[PDB]
């Protein structure tokens, strides 16, 4: 009937709460398709996932399929302009990304809902006729090189690659997926390879319709989405490529019973325990590896982790199954190590085996399966509506694994109790099948191997037969008990009717010395959930580096003692976030509203009556000192951002001041700080969700009453509700702060052009200018000039003040990066002069759509309200108001804004730059085809942050709405 369609699936199973409509189909050429119609959506989206990745790279061109992923964006026959795709998305309120894993290359975008076809037409060409232009191939290899360079000194990437280097060197698993300039240009040139032909051959060979899945989400009817996808994708050619498969495990006999001793970059101590397993993917209706991951990774009473933590050996544990590829998987148990735990690795692993033995002894528990199943069914029914871009991307990957009809449910719904599969996987978790890796700075100078891609220092050893035999004879330990029934499992899903006095925005329903309560009953999502957000103000959380340490330590110690009890709640969809701030403490409780007052009451009560276990105190103090030290290993651009915050904020304690004050934190001293912190508070809260005004007032007053009861809390004075100010930079001044990153051999730079206080006009001048320069400067500073992989521009907002920032990480020195940003900015003035009024209005419209895009789920709406609350602007209707103003702006207005605040000879230019030098740039000068860079003045070099701050005015704070 339709030659272009092989079949239309039956009804796609969805949550009864899901108003989107769905149609599955397979095209004649083999492409699996899901169409999602959402007549409400502001942004439309599509994604395509090709079932080939890294594991299919040619053995002689490592990173090719990842390079090819980069190259596809850079022009096609129909749309040859190198940034046609990204320009079009940017001008229509869209964004795009892609990723390459071992078996998939996944490409996705969103866009304004009226420009779906235009975005999709351009996207579709990536799969039809890429140009692989020779000149952008030569440029873009630098971006990929620069992606690898940022990962080199990253502990997680070094470990990911080291695993692959220690399995069978003949297995595709051993491949280096990222590639670099060496693998992708230098060595291919040496070996006479034409990389353009290789990209074309690989695309021709594997970009076959039979390995593709496409997902499209739009306002259009399912018939209209259907015709669209047929129109654009049925020309993709079927080469009938067999799906790559890897039935032989990369870890064979000689790779089992091995021990690795690895030297990390950061001062971290971890143990990684791995068992190879078969591919359990086909068992998704029973999911035996999840059942075992739930048990072995449990954190409640009776758990593996409870015992290892009581012994003072470990603080956290991850366990369960881990993906490999079609044909192989892994089962892991990874723990961090205390200093004692480091000396007790053999005992830790014996406990692991005793816990596993306990699972064998008790047998598979249908009631455990049934709990998993019940929780998954509730999670599925009440799942938050996803943002279109992540939703289409994720479904495109899974269309390759599940029947069309099951794609939404397949990952949630458990159907089959399989005690036979559970025993089978359990039979793999034996000491004869074990790989053990220990990461520790203690192994420095004690290693004799080097992994080639990252430089990782390590040593390999057979585990002694004596150690194995002892692990094999692990018997039952009375400390290990299966969890009991999870009582946090919610059963009340009633949606309270909308109150007669319910408001579109949060209403201030309580305004007392003690607490300010903003409340909104959900009028949009209608799921049985709520968010309860509390800011606790106290000047004692940040009065000095010592107090700041104590605030941190107190809250980590609290979360650590609550952890056993809160883990059940967290499995049951009820979580909390508790952290110290520069103003006090932040608490958020989210998830099913049912049992949420219980967890909340427990937290406040524990906080207000807290008793510190001295052993937990010492372990967590040592972890925190390392955590402060480990900042030295963060990335240069992260360093640049951190220093700018320190420079621009009235009060900010540095990592070095914090670490020096940490030796002075004693138990007695922490015990005294806590009652002191809690003796006087102001609480500002947002309670938002499936809750009434009276339940909100009750939760609020329960929190105060618990603090009053146990901690004798008294209100703060209004005048002590101290917000910090941003440093006010002088007209025409340019200051430079310089540091070195001692770990990474790239530079980072952050450049800040401070404008003025936030307000309706200043906001939208800045945001419009940003919108306009956003794609161009990625295109200029990355795509064309290839300064680095990380190239960022956009508004910076802090402390009621704002401005334009640029963040780049590069091999080039900061003074150089600076001239290029300055050259770029001139290009942008000319470009704004040269652009049509309609081009101008498309930018206003794109920013408009971006600002007006509706929250799809509760917590995204809360976050918007919460940003208004914590900034003390309380501008809940900002979006309509800012957008109405924006549409008023002209080309002339933006030219004038640029000329006044931003241009190199602007009368009110306020520029600060943070320069972070690469490990190997020794010292360095602060000042120094391609567009022409203007001459810059001599910067004032900041020598001392305190003096810099003392010598400048401070801005006002923004007035509340």
């Amino acid at each position: 009937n339709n030659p272009a369609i092989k079949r239309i699936g039956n009804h796609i199973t969805k949550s009864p709460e899901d108003k989107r409509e769905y149609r599955g189909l397979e095209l004649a050429n083999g492409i699996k398709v899901l169409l999602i119609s959402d007549p409400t959506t502001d942004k439309s989206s599509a994604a395509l996932d090709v079932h080939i990745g890294s594991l299919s790279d040619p053995p002689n061109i490592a990173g090719l399929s990842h390079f090819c992923q980069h190259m596809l964006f850079l022009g096609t026959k129909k749309y040859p302009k190198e940034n046609e795709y990204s320009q079009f998305l940017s001008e229509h309120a869209g964004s795009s990304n892609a990723f390459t894993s071992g078996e998939h290359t996944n490409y996705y975008f969103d866009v304004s809902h009226e420009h779906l076809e235009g975005a999709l037409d351009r996207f579709a060409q990536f799969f039809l006729c890429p140009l692989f232009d020779e000149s952008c191939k030569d440029r873009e290899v630098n971006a990929v090189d620069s992606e690898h360079e940022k990962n080199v000194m990253n502990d997680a990437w070094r470990l990911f690659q080291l695993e692959k280097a220690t399995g069978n060197p003949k297995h595709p698993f051993s491949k280096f997926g990222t590639g670099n300039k060496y693998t992708l240009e230098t060595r291919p040139n040496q070996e006479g390879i034409d990389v353009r032909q290789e990209l074309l051959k690989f695309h021709s060979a594997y970009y076959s319709s039979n390995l593709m899945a496409v997902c499209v989400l739009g306002r259009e009817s399912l018939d209209d989405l259907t015709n669209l996808v047929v129109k654009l994708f049925s020309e993709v050619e079927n080469k009938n490529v067999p799906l790559p498969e890897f039935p032989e495990h990369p870890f064979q006999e000689e790779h089992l019973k091995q021990l690795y001793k690895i030297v990390p970059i950061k001062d971290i101590r971890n143990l990684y325990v791995t068992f190879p397993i078969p591919d359990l993917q086909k068992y998704y209706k029973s999911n035996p590896g999840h059942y075992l991951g739930h048990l072995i990774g449990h954190e409640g009473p009776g758990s593996l982790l409870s015992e290892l933590k009581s012994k003072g050996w470990v603080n956290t544990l991850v366990g369960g199954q881990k993906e490999g590829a079609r044909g192989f998987m892994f089962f892991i148990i990874n723990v961090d190590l205390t200093e004692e735990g480091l000396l007790h690795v053999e005992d830790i692993i014996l406990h692991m085996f005793q816990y596993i033995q306990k699972l064998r002894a008790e047998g598979p528990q249908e009631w455990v399966f049934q709990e998993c199943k019940d929780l998954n069914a509730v999670a599925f029914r009440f799942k938050d509506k996803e943002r279109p871009r992540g939703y289409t991307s994720k479904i495109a990957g899974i269309l390759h694994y599940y029947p069309l009809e099951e794609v939404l449910t397949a990952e949630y719904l458990l159907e089959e109790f399989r005690p036979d599969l559970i025993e089978m996987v359990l039979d793999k978790l034996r000491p004869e099948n074990v790989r053990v890796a220990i990461v520790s700075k203690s192994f420095e100078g004690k290693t004799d191997r080097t992994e080639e891609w990252y430089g990782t220092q390590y040593k390999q050893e057979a585990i002694p037969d004596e150690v194995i035999k002892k692990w094999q004879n692990a018997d039952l330990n009375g400390k290990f008990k299966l969890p009991t029934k999870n009582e946090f499992i919610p059963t009340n899903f009633e949606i309270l009717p909308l109150e007669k006095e319910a408001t579109p925005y949060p209403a201030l329903i309580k305004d007392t010395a003690m607490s300010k309560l903003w409340f909104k009953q959900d009028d949009k999502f209608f799921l049985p959930k709520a968010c309860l957000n509390f800011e606790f103000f106290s000047p004692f959380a940040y009065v000095d580096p010592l107090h700041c340490n104590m605030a941190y330590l107190y809250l980590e110690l609290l979360k650590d003692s609550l952890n056993e009890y809160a883990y059940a709640a967290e499995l049951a969809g009820l979580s909390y976030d508790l952290q110290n701030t520069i103003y006090g403490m932040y608490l958020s409780v989210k998830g099913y509203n049912d049992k949420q007052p219980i967890l909340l009451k427990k937290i406040i009560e524990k906080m207000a009556t807290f008793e510190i276990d001295e052993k937990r105190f010492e372990i967590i103090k040592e972890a925190y000192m390392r955590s402060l030290n480990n900042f030295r290993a963060e990335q240069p651009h992260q360093h640049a951002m951190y220093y700018l915050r320190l420079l621009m904020t009235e009060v900010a304690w540095t990592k070095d001041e914090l670490k020096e004050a940490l030796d002075d934190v004693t138990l007695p001293r922490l015990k005294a700080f806590i009652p002191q912190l809690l003796s006087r508070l102001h609480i500002e809260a947002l309670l938002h969700g499936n809750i009434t005004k009276q339940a909100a007032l009750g939760i609020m007053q329960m929190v105060e009453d618990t603090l009053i009861e146990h901690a004798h809390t008294k209100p703060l004075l209004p005048s002590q509700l101290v917000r910090y100010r941003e440093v006010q930079l002088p007209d025409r001044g340019w200051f430079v702060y310089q540091q070195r990153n001692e770990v990474h051999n790239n530079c980072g730079i952050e450049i800040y052009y401070q404008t003025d206080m936030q307000s309706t006009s200043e906001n939208m001048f800045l945001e419009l200018f940003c919108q306009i320069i956003s794609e161009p400067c990625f295109n200029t500073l990355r795509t064309k000039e290839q300064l680095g992989y990380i190239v960022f521009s956009g508004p910076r907002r802090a402390n009621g003040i704002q401005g334009l920032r640029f963040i780049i990480q590069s091999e080039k020195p900061p003074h150089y990066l600076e001239s290029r940003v300055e050259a770029f900015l001139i290009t942008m003035e000319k470009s704004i002069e040269d652009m049509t009024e309609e081009a101008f209005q498309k930018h206003i419209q794109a920013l408009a759509i971006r600002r007006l895009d509706k929250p799809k789920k509760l917590s995204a709406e809360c976050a918007k309200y919460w940003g208004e609350i914590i900034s003390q602007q309380y501008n809940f209707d900002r979006d309509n108001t800012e957008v109405a103003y924006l549409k008023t702006l002209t080309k002339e207005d933006i030219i004038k804004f640029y000329k006044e605040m931003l241009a190199v000879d602007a009368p009110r230019r306020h520029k600060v730059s943070v320069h972070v030098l690469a490990r190997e740039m020794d010292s360095c000068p602060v000042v120094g085809n391609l567009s022409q860079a203007p001459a810059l003045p001599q910067p004032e070099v900041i020598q001392n942050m305190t003096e810099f701050k003392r010598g400048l005015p401070l801005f006002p704070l923004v007035k509340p709405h």
């Binding site: 999840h290 991951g293 739930h294 990774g297 954190e299 956290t316 544990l317 991850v318 366990g319 369960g320 199954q321 881990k322 892991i332």
Partner: peptide, 5 residues
Amino acid sequence: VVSHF
């Protein structure tokens, strides 16, 4: 925790 996410 269960390996994810």
